[PDB]
Write a protein that binds this ligand. Structure first.
Ligand code: ATP
Ligand code: ATP
Ligand code: MG
Ligand code: MG
Lengths: 70, 108, 395, 102, 405
């Protein structure tokens, strides 16, 4: 304070997960990939784990670059 | 000190010129001596109770070095308002006491 | 009334500011004896609580093998126990003597500091700390009485050089006696006001104690504490309480009080030198005092406060009517003549009643008639209750 | 049964806790302080447990004080009224109008 | 080694008690609501406004350890719990003193900084740390049970209007116990100290205690009442000790009025419980002589004494300087006796056949107590017959009960 004056003076409903995706055991039952994606899971995606994805198209394969260990 | 007693509260022009002249002619190390504290009193004595006739004098004290200027500015301003009770001036005085320094810079 | 609204506004702000100041500074408690925070050195107090250990008060009883390099001290720790202890290394062996109180720690009980002798709190309260507001100028008609009083109780302490050079031992005792109201305690109050040495006021009725030998104990501790001073003055007001003459009425009549008087006699002039104490006793019944107490060397000077003469009574009238709003030509010599044998106490009352009649009549100045009526009311009307006629036979 | 067994094992430890002093309240003070008289050990100025109301600490009340902190933690049943104790020793026989004749 | 030397002058506590502490704001005059008072009121406010800003700035940059609530918390830590209550035996130094715990064991402890050092006196109750016994506070001594006995907590309901015929007596007693306090300027402009003491003497029932009761009703000063027979104690020196303590309570509660009622009863009555005989009573009197007019300076204490036997008192006790005024209370005359009957029959409902003139001459030596006793017994007689109206027969049987038999 200055001198005294004297007398005079909107959380989203969804969230996208990259590959690999940290998916909870409970997220599996609610997590489902978008319809328009070129990849479709072989087994149901709610099972979890390693899932092989069918390819509808034959375009350039955009992979995920490996990361070196610390 | 002595010239201050002869010309106390008189605002003598002659003594003001020489006291100011001596104050800035002294060295930075010379003003460190505590006997140098007396030169402002002689200037302060001349304006004892005069009041606001110091703004010209206080302007002259601007040119002199620190921390002697802060002491000289405070002293002569005090003798200006001696026996006046001007609370606004006392308001400034308490602000000077408010900020503490961890002696040399706090002589004023 | 125009400023009434604004005055309360600034009065309330000041009270609110005052309370707000007390919030930061702190003005509270005061029932556990807490000092204002301006005197609080908390940093030091924490250091004292560790650096300075507490010391238990003990009395040395005997030093064993004081000649050798291993002197052992027997101490009596009040009601706790008795210990044979050695001296601490931060005090000198010559500083501890047998029979002297010492301070000992709680671990090995080694003596850490000598202590002053134990004095009864009642005896400690007997020394005058605030001097009276009465000077010798307030005592009239006692010119010869005061000079005799001063040259024994004041002059030796003020200018001791005038007596040592001539080989003079000034008297160390004065007895003031006279009828009540004659100025006995008034002069002693003037002595305490003027004195520079320690003054101890002792009322004889204060020396009367419930238990056997307790009254004589207080006399011993009184002179013990008076001796702890370079020069001291003891005032024994109403010494007839304990100074009565010894007698044997078959039963043990006044045997205990006589012992207190015998102790007082012993300290004044006994085997041991008294010290630089100059005693001073006042009594309105000097005929009742013991011959041993009324003997030179205990009460060397016997100053009599007889009723004032005409010059003395006029002087006392001037003293008490000094600050009054009296008239022009108050014949104070005439008023002194209207009360032939009257104490200074009656004269003061005459002055008070004289102005009291003026207050009665809503008058700001006391006339001579008011004093004449005051003399009639005090000297004449109140002569039935006069203590003078009975007490001149005693003095 | 299980709680009864559990209370018994904890009781052995609880019985080893030092007992509480018995004191008489002289007068309650500010800041939740009370002046008490421990039975053989004179007077103390003590704190009051957070579960004891300072308004219930009346003068001349028996209270239990902790072993080390001497904290007032329990209001013991009040002692005999001094007037009652005075009238027990005097022991004036109780009377009614029916036992008065003439 | 050298003995410690105190910086404080003497061993006694400060005389001032119960002040405004730091709330002693300057006395602003005049009290009239004017600009000068407003200017002075603002002047006090201005400095406080500076004071508030200055103190806040320091505490703002003060270390977290050094704070008003933190330092107070640290004080409690330094004091500890429990807080032992001891006795101050001697003040060795400013920060050192000799104290004794309740077990009688003395200790040489250190007076801590936060202790109110000007409340320290020998014999006072000191608060000590439980562990290190250092002086950590002073116990504000509770009101002694002896204090409660003297003090008349509630002023009596008897006024001066309830007293009849003692017009001069009221006027003399007012001028020494009432006028000096209500209008002290009258005495200062005259230069006279008020009449020091007053004694009320006369036959029994003449109104000596009644006037004192009227004094206690209209007094702003503390009223202490002690009957003279209460100064006869069962132990030696206790009587003198009690007289000394009675005026010590008077000193604390200044201004005060001490009423020594039935002062003559101290010597005219001999009790075997008094171990010392007339000799202890004499020492009790000698203490009373010192308290009335002695060496110690007396504050604002006015002494009222009452006795029906003033000839039996020691003449030195009621000498001027001790008791300046000797107000006599004679038996009422016809004019006063009628007023006393009207005073005590005012709240009564009387019969038309009762007359106070005939009741005036019930007895030649009729006192106010006899007049009042006639009335209350007359009302009691009416109460027996289940009546509210007192008849002349009730008064007739009243006189034969109190005055005779
Ligand atoms: N010589 C005097 N000059 C002036 N005033 C006097 C003188 N003598 C007595 N007085 C006044 O009379 C009062 C009587 O009190 P004082 O203490 O002098 O009596 P005292 O002689 O000691 O009596 P007691 O024998 O009853 O103790 C004094 O307080 C003082 O005001
Ligand atoms: N002058 C009076 N006017 C009115 N009532 C009076 C008067 N005198 C006495 N009385 C009544 O008498 C009652 C008893 O008298 P009181 O207690 O005043 O006696 P006292 O004069 O102190 O005498 P003592 O103590 O010697 O018996 C009072 O309560 C009061 O009601
Ligand atoms: Mg005297
Ligand atoms: Mg009575």
């Amino acid at each position: 304070v200055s001198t005294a004056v004297l007398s005079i003076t909107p959380e989203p409903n969804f969230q996208l997960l990259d590959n690999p995706a940290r998916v909870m055991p409970a997220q599996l039952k609610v997590l489902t990939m978008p319809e328009t994606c070129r990849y479709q899971p072989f087994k149901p995606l709610s099972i979890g784990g390693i899932i092989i994805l069918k390819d509808t198209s034959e375009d350039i394969e955009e992979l995920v670059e490996p990361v070196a260990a610390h | 000190l002595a010239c201050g007693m002869i010309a106390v509260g008189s605002c003598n022009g002659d003594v003001t010129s020489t006291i100011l002249q001596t104050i800035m002619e002294k060295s930075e190390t010379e003003l460190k001596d505590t006997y140098a504290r007396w030169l402002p009193l002689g200037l302060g004595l001349n304006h004892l109770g005069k009041g606001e006739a110091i703004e010209a004098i206080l302007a002259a004290l601007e040119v002199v070095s620190e921390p002697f200027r802060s002491f000289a500015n405070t002293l002569v301003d005090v003798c200006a308002y001696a026996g006046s009770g001007n609370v606004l001036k006392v308001q400034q005085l308490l602000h000077i006491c408010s900020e503490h320094f961890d002696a040399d810079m706090g002589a004023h | 009334s125009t400023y009434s609204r604004q005055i309360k506004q600034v009065e309330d702000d000041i009270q609110q500011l005052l309370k707000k100041i007390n919030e930061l500074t702190g003005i509270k408690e005061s029932d556990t004896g807490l000092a204002p925070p301006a005197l609080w050195d908390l940093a030091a107090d924490k250091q004292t609580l560790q650096s300075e250990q507490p010391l238990q008060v003990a009395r040395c009883t005997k030093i064993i093998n004081a000649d050798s390099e291993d002197p052992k001290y027997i101490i009596n720790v009040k009601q706790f126990a008795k210990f044979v202890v050695d001296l601490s290394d931060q005090v000198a062996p010559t500083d501890i003597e047998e029979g002297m109180r010492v301070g000992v720690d709680r671990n090995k009980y080694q003596i850490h500091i000598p202590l002053p002798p134990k004095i009864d709190p009642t005896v400690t309260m007997m020394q005058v700390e605030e001097k009276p507001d009465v000077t010798y100028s307030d005592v009239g008609g006692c010119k010869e009485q005061i000079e005799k009083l001063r040259e024994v109780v004041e002059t030796p302490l003020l200018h001791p050089e005038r007596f040592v050079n001539l080989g003079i031992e000034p008297p160390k005792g004065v007895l003031l006696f006279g009828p009540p109201g004659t100025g006995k305690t008034l002069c002693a109050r003037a002595v305490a006001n003027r004195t520079d040495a320690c003054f101890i006021r002792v009322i004889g009725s204060e020396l009367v104690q419930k238990y056997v030998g307790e009254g004589a104990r207080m006399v011993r501790e009184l002179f013990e504490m008076a001796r702890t001073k370079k020069a001291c003055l003891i005032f024994f007001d109403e010494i007839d309480a304990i100074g009565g003459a010894r007698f044997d009425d078959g039963a043990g009549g006044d045997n205990e009080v006589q012992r207190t008087m015998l102790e007082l006699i012993n300290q004044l002039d006994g085997f041991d030198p008294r010290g630089n104490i100059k005693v001073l006793m006042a009594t309105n019944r000097p005929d009742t005092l013991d011959p041993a107490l009324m003997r030179p060397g205990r009460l060397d000077r016997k100053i009599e406060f007889s009723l004032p003469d005409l010059e003395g009574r006029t002087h006392i009238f001037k003293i008490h009517a000094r600050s009054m709003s009296v008239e022009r030509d108050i014949r104070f010599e005439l008023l002194a003549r209207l009360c032939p044998n009257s104490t200074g106490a009656e004269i003061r009352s005459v002055c008070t009643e004289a102005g009291m009649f003026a207050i009665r009549a809503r008058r700001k100045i006391a006339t001579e008639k008011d004093f004449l009526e005051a003399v009639n009311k005090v000297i004449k009307s109140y002569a039935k209750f006069s203590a003078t006629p009975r007490y001149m036979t005693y003095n | 049964l299980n709680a009864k067994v559990r209370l018994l094992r904890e009781e052995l430890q609880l019985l080893q806790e030092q007992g509480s002093y018995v004191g008489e309240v002289v007068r309650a003070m500010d800041k939740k302080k009370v002046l008490v008289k421990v039975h053989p050990e004179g007077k103390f100025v003590v704190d009051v447990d957070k579960n004891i109301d300072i308004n219930d600490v009346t003068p001349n009340c028996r209270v239990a004080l902790r072993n080390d902190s001497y904290t007032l933690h329990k209001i013991l049943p009040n002692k005999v009224d001094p007037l009652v104790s005075l009238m027990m020793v005097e022991k004036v026989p109780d009377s009614t109008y029916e036992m008065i004749g003439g | 080694y050298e003995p410690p030397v105190p910086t404080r002058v003497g061993k006694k506590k400060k005389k001032t008690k119960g002040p405004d502490a730091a709330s002693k704001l300057p006395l602003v005059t005049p009290h009239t609501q004017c600009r000068l008072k407003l200017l002075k009121l603002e002047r006090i406010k201005d400095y406080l406004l500076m004071e508030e800003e200055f103190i806040r700035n320091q505490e703002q940059m003060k270390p977290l350890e050094e704070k008003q609530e933190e330092e107070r918390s640290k004080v409690d830590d330094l004091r500890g719990t429990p807080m032992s209550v001891g006795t101050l035996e001697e003040i060795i130094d400013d920060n050192h003193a000799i104290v004794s715990t309740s077990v009688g064991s003395e200790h040489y402890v250190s007076i801590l900084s936060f202790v109110d050092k000007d409340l320290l006196e020998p014999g006072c109750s000191v608060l000590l740390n439980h562990k290190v016994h250092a002086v950590i506070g002073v116990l504000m001594d509770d009101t002694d049970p002896l204090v409660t006995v003297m003090k008349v907590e509630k002023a009596p309901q008897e006024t001066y209007a309830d007293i009849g015929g003692l017009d001069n007596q009221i006027q003399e007693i007012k001028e020494s116990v009432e006028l000096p306090l209500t209008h002290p300027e009258y005495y200062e402009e005259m230069g006279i100290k008020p009449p020091k003491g007053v004694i009320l003497y006369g036959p029994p029932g003449t109104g000596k205690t009644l006037l004192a009761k009227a004094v206690a009703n209209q007094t702003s000063a503390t009223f202490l009442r002690v009957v003279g027979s209460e100064l006869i104690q069962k132990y030696l020196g206790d009587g003198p000790k009690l007289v000394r303590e009675l005026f010590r309570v008077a000193e604390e509660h200044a201004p005060s009025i001490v009423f020594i009622d039935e002062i003559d009863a101290i010597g005219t009555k001999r009790y075997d419980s008094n171990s010392g005989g007339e000799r202890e009573i004499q020492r009790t009197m000698l203490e009373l002589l010192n308290q009335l007019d002695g060496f110690d300076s007396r504050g604002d204490v006015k002494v009222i004494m009452a006795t029906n036997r003033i000839e039996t008192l020691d003449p030195a006790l009621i000498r001027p300087g001790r008791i300046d005024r000797k107000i006599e209370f004679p038996l009422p005359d016809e004019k006063t006796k009628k007023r006393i009957f009207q005073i005590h029959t005012s709240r009564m409902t009387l019969a038309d056949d009762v007359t106070l003139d005939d009741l005036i001459m019930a007895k030649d030596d009729l006192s106010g107590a006899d007049i009042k006793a006639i009335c209350t017994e007359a009302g009691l007689m009416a109460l027996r017959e289940r009546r509210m109206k007192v008849t002349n027969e009730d008064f007739k049987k009243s006189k034969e009960n109190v005055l005779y038999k």
